Design an enzyme around this catalytic site. Structure first.
Site, PDB file in Angstrom:
ATOM      1  N   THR A  18      13.355 -11.060  11.142  1.00  0.00           N
ATOM      2  CA  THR A  18      14.652 -11.727  11.210  1.00  0.00           C
ATOM      3  C   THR A  18      15.407 -11.280  12.470  1.00  0.00           C
ATOM      4  O   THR A  18      14.859 -10.523  13.288  1.00  0.00           O
ATOM      5  CB  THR A  18      15.517 -11.447   9.955  1.00  0.00           C
ATOM      6  OG1 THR A  18      16.658 -12.320   9.941  1.00  0.00           O
ATOM      7  CG2 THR A  18      15.983  -9.998   9.920  1.00  0.00           C
ATOM      8  N   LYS A  59      12.728 -12.522  16.333  1.00  0.00           N
ATOM      9  CA  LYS A  59      11.817 -13.635  16.076  1.00  0.00           C
ATOM     10  C   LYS A  59      11.025 -14.049  17.316  1.00  0.00           C
ATOM     11  O   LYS A  59       9.820 -14.269  17.241  1.00  0.00           O
ATOM     12  CB  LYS A  59      12.569 -14.824  15.486  1.00  0.00           C
ATOM     13  CG  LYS A  59      13.201 -14.538  14.152  1.00  0.00           C
ATOM     14  CD  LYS A  59      13.566 -15.858  13.468  1.00  0.00           C
ATOM     15  CE  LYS A  59      14.667 -15.674  12.460  1.00  0.00           C
ATOM     16  NZ  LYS A  59      14.880 -16.895  11.626  1.00  0.00           N
ATOM     17  N   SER A  93      15.765 -10.408   1.237  1.00  0.00           N
ATOM     18  CA  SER A  93      14.332 -10.472   0.945  1.00  0.00           C
ATOM     19  C   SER A  93      13.857  -9.318   0.066  1.00  0.00           C
ATOM     20  O   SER A  93      13.098  -9.534  -0.874  1.00  0.00           O
ATOM     21  CB  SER A  93      13.504 -10.508   2.233  1.00  0.00           C
ATOM     22  OG  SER A  93      13.782 -11.682   2.971  1.00  0.00           O
ATOM     23  N   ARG A 122      19.422 -26.323  25.637  1.00  0.00           N
ATOM     24  CA  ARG A 122      18.651 -26.188  24.392  1.00  0.00           C
ATOM     25  C   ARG A 122      18.369 -27.531  23.761  1.00  0.00           C
ATOM     26  O   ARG A 122      17.300 -27.736  23.170  1.00  0.00           O
ATOM     27  CB  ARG A 122      19.301 -25.213  23.407  1.00  0.00           C
ATOM     28  CG  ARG A 122      19.090 -23.743  23.813  1.00  0.00           C
ATOM     29  CD  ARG A 122      19.524 -22.768  22.720  1.00  0.00           C
ATOM     30  NE  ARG A 122      20.977 -22.781  22.506  1.00  0.00           N
ATOM     31  CZ  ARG A 122      21.862 -22.102  23.240  1.00  0.00           C
ATOM     32  NH1 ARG A 122      21.456 -21.350  24.253  1.00  0.00           N
ATOM     33  NH2 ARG A 122      23.162 -22.179  22.968  1.00  0.00           N
TER      34      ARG A 122
HETATM   35  N1  NAD Z   1      19.191 -20.349   5.184  1.00  0.00           N
HETATM   36  C1  NAD Z   1      18.252 -19.792   5.879  1.00  0.00           C
HETATM   37  O1  NAD Z   1      17.156 -19.557   5.434  1.00  0.00           O
HETATM   38  C2  NAD Z   1      18.567 -19.458   7.318  1.00  0.00           C
HETATM   39  C3  NAD Z   1      17.507 -19.034   8.075  1.00  0.00           C
HETATM   40  C4  NAD Z   1      17.722 -18.718   9.381  1.00  0.00           C
HETATM   41  C5  NAD Z   1      18.980 -18.840   9.955  1.00  0.00           C
HETATM   42  N2  NAD Z   1      20.049 -19.274   9.249  1.00  0.00           N
HETATM   43  C6  NAD Z   1      21.360 -19.426   9.914  1.00  0.00           C
HETATM   44  O2  NAD Z   1      21.201 -20.423  10.892  1.00  0.00           O
HETATM   45  C7  NAD Z   1      22.211 -20.304  11.871  1.00  0.00           C
HETATM   46  C8  NAD Z   1      21.592 -20.407  13.252  1.00  0.00           C
HETATM   47  O3  NAD Z   1      20.521 -19.566  13.549  1.00  0.00           O
HETATM   48  P1  NAD Z   1      19.810 -19.572  14.774  1.00  0.00           P
HETATM   49  O4  NAD Z   1      19.029 -18.534  14.625  1.00  0.00           O
HETATM   50  O5  NAD Z   1      19.225 -20.799  14.826  1.00  0.00           O
HETATM   51  O6  NAD Z   1      20.773 -19.330  15.870  1.00  0.00           O
HETATM   52  P2  NAD Z   1      20.803 -19.832  17.316  1.00  0.00           P
HETATM   53  O7  NAD Z   1      21.793 -19.253  18.023  1.00  0.00           O
HETATM   54  O8  NAD Z   1      19.521 -19.566  17.823  1.00  0.00           O
HETATM   55  O9  NAD Z   1      20.998 -21.276  17.392  1.00  0.00           O
HETATM   56  C9  NAD Z   1      22.135 -21.894  17.048  1.00  0.00           C
HETATM   57  C10 NAD Z   1      22.412 -23.122  17.843  1.00  0.00           C
HETATM   58  O10 NAD Z   1      23.607 -23.663  17.409  1.00  0.00           O
HETATM   59  C11 NAD Z   1      24.143 -24.316  18.395  1.00  0.00           C
HETATM   60  N3  NAD Z   1      25.518 -24.820  18.127  1.00  0.00           N
HETATM   61  C12 NAD Z   1      26.588 -24.098  18.165  1.00  0.00           C
HETATM   62  N4  NAD Z   1      27.618 -24.806  17.917  1.00  0.00           N
HETATM   63  C13 NAD Z   1      27.228 -25.998  17.650  1.00  0.00           C
HETATM   64  C14 NAD Z   1      27.864 -27.164  17.314  1.00  0.00           C
HETATM   65  N5  NAD Z   1      29.157 -27.242  17.165  1.00  0.00           N
HETATM   66  N6  NAD Z   1      27.172 -28.241  17.147  1.00  0.00           N
HETATM   67  C15 NAD Z   1      25.912 -28.225  17.274  1.00  0.00           C
HETATM   68  N7  NAD Z   1      25.284 -27.148  17.595  1.00  0.00           N
HETATM   69  C16 NAD Z   1      25.894 -26.010  17.802  1.00  0.00           C
HETATM   70  C17 NAD Z   1      24.021 -23.257  19.511  1.00  0.00           C
HETATM   71  O11 NAD Z   1      24.214 -23.750  20.749  1.00  0.00           O
HETATM   72  C18 NAD Z   1      22.594 -22.808  19.315  1.00  0.00           C
HETATM   73  O12 NAD Z   1      21.719 -23.551  20.055  1.00  0.00           O
HETATM   74  C19 NAD Z   1      22.932 -18.996  11.563  1.00  0.00           C
HETATM   75  O13 NAD Z   1      24.061 -19.181  10.757  1.00  0.00           O
HETATM   76  C20 NAD Z   1      21.853 -18.302  10.759  1.00  0.00           C
HETATM   77  O14 NAD Z   1      22.426 -17.311  10.031  1.00  0.00           O
HETATM   78  C21 NAD Z   1      19.835 -19.594   7.907  1.00  0.00           C
END
Ligand code: NAD
Ligand code: MN
Ligand code: MN
Ligand code: MN
Length: 266
Positions: A65, A69, A19, A159
């Site tokens: 971030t 959050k 950012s 979840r």
């Molecule tokens: N591109 C962007 O702007 C952006 C923004 C935010 C987060 N992200 C990425 O998003 C991802 C997740 O972030 P989060 O904050 O939501 O994390 P999180 O942990 O809160 O949530 C992730 C979810 O994924 C689930 N999960 C794990 N394995 C899985 C599978 N095989 N199948 C289905 N679901 C599964 C977990 O149980 C959990 O509920 C990370 O890689 C993060 O870096 C990208």
């Protein structure tokens, strides 16, 4: 520089965030007396930080971030409707009087990128893989935008059930499901899980499911490194449009800035 007004991004760790260069690059190109600075804040100082923000008079706002959050959603003065429903924020605007208002624009960021790929949610069917913070924001944005149907996947039953409930009682005219045997009938397939990250990147879906992927589908991923996940690589090989994590992140910068009152919607 003594008179530069500020925004910030807070989290831990913070060295990896993009950012600042992105906002500063923009600030420079349009000659703004503004700057974004990074704050790697230790968790013990969360309450102090919220209070410092209220008293921080030349600060306009603060992106949020990992892993703050949810924690900061609970510490601000006001929440947008979506932020309140999601229980998390990724942006804070500081009012002139010191009140902290929070919002969550992960969802809008995702839709923005999707639009550029020609995806209009109204009346469609989406599969969201990952019911976490980002996954719920995405599902919720899809629902608000009038999607017909959302199917969910997450090994975490708790979840998945929480997002079933969020959607189910937020949107009576929206069909939700956690059961499916192919990908043929999804207009959008979105990975919102950590699966796909890193130099040993794996796939969130079995080969059997992937074999059912159709060309007309938009396949999207939130993962930022690699930009092209095994999931996206396979989607592209099948002829699907694909949307990347960096695309979603970049499509947000436009919303974060506007919520902070530092950038136009763009
Ligand atoms: N591109 C962007 O702007 C952006 C923004 C935010 C987060 N992200 C990425 O998003 C991802 C997740 O972030 P989060 O904050 O939501 O994390 P999180 O942990 O809160 O949530 C992730 C979810 O994924 C689930 N999960 C794990 N394995 C899985 C599978 N095989 N199948 C289905 N679901 C599964 C977990 O149980 C959990 O509920 C990370 O890689 C993060 O870096 C990208
Ligand atoms: Mn300006
Ligand atoms: Mn699944
Ligand atoms: Mn459900």
């Amino acid at each position: 520089r003594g008179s530069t007004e500020l925004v910030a991004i807070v989290g831990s760790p913070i060295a990896q965030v993009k950012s600042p260069q992105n906002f500063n690059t923009w600030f420079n190109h349009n000659n703004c007396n503004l700057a974004m600075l990074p704050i790697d804040l230790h968790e013990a100082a969360l309450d102090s930080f919220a209070d410092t923000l209220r008293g921080w008079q030349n600060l306009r706002g603060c992106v949020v971030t990992v892993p703050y959050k949810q924690a900061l959603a609970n510490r601000v003065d006001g929440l947008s409707e979506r932020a309140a429903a999601l229980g998390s924020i990724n942006v804070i605007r500081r009012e002139r009087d010191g009140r902290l208002l929070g919002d969550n624009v992960d969802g809008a960021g995702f839709l923005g990128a999707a639009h550029k790929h020609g995806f209009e949610p109204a009346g469609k069917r989406a599969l969201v893989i990952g019911c976490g913070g980002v996954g719920s924001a995405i599902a919720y944005a899809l629902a608000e935008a009038g999607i017909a149907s959302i199917t969910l996947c997450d090994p975490s039953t708790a979840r998945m059930g929480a997002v079933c409930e969020l959607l189910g009682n937020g949107f009576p005219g929206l069909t939700v499901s956690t059961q499916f045997s192919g990908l043929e009938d999804f207009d959008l397939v979105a990975n919102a899980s950590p699966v796909g990250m890193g130099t040993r990147a794996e796939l969130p879906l079995s080969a059997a499911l992937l074999a059912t992927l159709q060309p007309d589908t938009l396949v999207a991923d939130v993962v930022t490194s690699p930009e092209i996940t095994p999931l996206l690589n396979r989607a592209r090989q099948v002829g699907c449009r694909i949307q990347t994590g960096p695309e979603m992140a970049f499509a947000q910068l436009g919303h974060l800035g506007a919520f902070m009152g530092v950038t136009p919607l763009e």
